[PDB]
Design a protein around this ligand. Structure first.
Ligand SMILES: Nc1ccn([C@@H]2O[C@H](COP(=O)(O)O)[C@@H](O)[C@H]2O)c(=O)n1
Ligand SMILES: Nc1ccn([C@@H]2O[C@H](COP(=O)(O)O)[C@@H](O)[C@H]2O)c(=O)n1
Ligand SMILES: Nc1ccn([C@@H]2O[C@H](COP(=O)(O)O)[C@@H](O)[C@H]2O)c(=O)n1
Ligand SMILES: CC(C)=CCC/C(C)=C/COP(=O)(O)OP(=O)(O)O
Ligand SMILES: [Zn+2]
Ligand SMILES: [Zn+2]
Ligand SMILES: [Zn+2]
Lengths: 157, 158, 157
């Protein structure tokens, strides 16, 4: 018994760095603006896990509206989403995350991202894949306006 | 036992007057959606994910511009026919997940109804269908309000 | 066990045609700029297969440091990735690729892409889906500045 999910997120650059991606603080000349900490990777992953569980999305569980989630970081949101998915009967298959960013270079921070996600999800590191790619100077990411992320997940019952 | 994955992606540009139709739900908006079809970007991407999982190509291959049969059909009809053809290969539904990418309008209040309509079209339980939405934080064509995109993934079982 | 992977790739138009998509040469006013042959569909597919197996991505597997695959075409890269993935004990479930291009027209060329991909992955044609879509003149693909590709893959252990 297996179930698929998909997530996608974008955050627009603003302010100063560091930016936070997959739980890791990365030195960069500007920050990521958000109601939240702007962790596009953990947000997209959270939506994919919630999607596979038919529990909706991050905004559904954690409205900006609701003061209870004020100041929560993305790993806290991920762990809470995961607790609710697990109470629904699911366990982790695997996840795959694709960060879309012209800069900064992601791959030196990626090992650490994988450990944080694997810790947060109670899974083996081998169940977690993160990668990055540019859009070769094209689009809002290529122009350096923001960063995006796509993620997929497989849950088991 | 045998499960199969598919992915769908669709975009339409805003044009004319609202409402827009997303996941079979009429949503009031200042703009409509330009399409030869009803412009239902969610059902179109979902349809391609399902066809994708079944290796049946895509909506364009099933319903060519030049085939009169389905010219003028709404997207739920196309979804229901695509689905008929997928089941004729011996597939049933695992689950689906849809990700609407739109700066506006707000989708979340209409998602419950979209899910009802998809579940009835696919003959499945509500629990096998997820729909979500995200903005692009005012970035890109979606963020500027030029149109709406949608991705979908699907799992089928043989 | 089944595992899921996701890939995404983009190359900008530049130079003269033809471009190569899914191993198939397609005439066009412009080429695709790239260090490699610029086959976005093969690169996205390769990344989806590597992500499923948690082997990272095409840049991790083939760094500029390694002379072995420098100047290698995208089918050679796909086949090497697939060798590394099979060595981890995986075989193919199925793949689905989505080319995102305003132009050129991809439809007539898709049948040979599928044959080439099934050859390279040692699978049946029925395990390979390839489709194309435009973005209706929106965004960087819509204005003919480049071509993007998404892909997903399911592996079995
Ligand atoms: N068109 C849209 C865009 C987003 N949303 C909801 O609002 C939330 C916030 O979206 P952002 O994270 O892109 O700011 C999402 O998690 C989604 O629940 C919506 O309901 N309709
Ligand atoms: N570059 C592209 C884009 C779309 N197409 C085809 O045209 C059909 C309709 O595309 P749109 O919905 O993007 O207008 C699709 O089925 C696809 O097969 C193509 O063959 N090459
Ligand atoms: N922001 C980014 C973008 C790409 N990368 C790495 O660089 C490689 C090449 O990506 P591009 O093809 O977009 O140039 C990738 O395979 C990825 O491993 C990165 O580490 N950080
Ligand atoms: C969901 C998918 C497929 C995401 C990848 C596409 C992407 C990040 C495009 C960026 O610019 P754009 O296409 O909006 O162009 P521009 O901002 O230059 O109009
Ligand atoms: Zn976010
Ligand atoms: Zn459409
Ligand atoms: Zn590439």
């Amino acid at each position: 018994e297996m179930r698929i999910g998909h997530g996608f997120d974008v955050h627009a650059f603003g302010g100063e760095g560091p930016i936070i991606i997959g739980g890791v603080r990365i030195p960069y000349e500007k920050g990521l603006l958000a109601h939240s900490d702007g962790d596009v990777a953990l947000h997209a992953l959270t939506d994919a896990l919630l999607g596979a569980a038919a529990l909706g999305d991050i905004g559904k569980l954690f409205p900006d509206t609701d003061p209870a989630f004020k100041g929560a970081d993305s790993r806290e949101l991920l762990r809470e989403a995961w607790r609710r998915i697990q109470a629904k009967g699911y366990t982790l298959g695997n996840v795959d995350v694709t960060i879309i960013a012209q800069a900064p270079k992601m791959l030196p921070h990626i090992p650490q991202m994988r450990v944080f996600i694997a810790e947060d999800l109670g899974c083996h590191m081998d169940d977690v894949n993160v990668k990055a790619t540019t859009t070769e100077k094209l689009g809002f990411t290529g122009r350096g306006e923001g960063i995006a992320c796509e993620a997929v997940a497989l849950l088991i019952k």
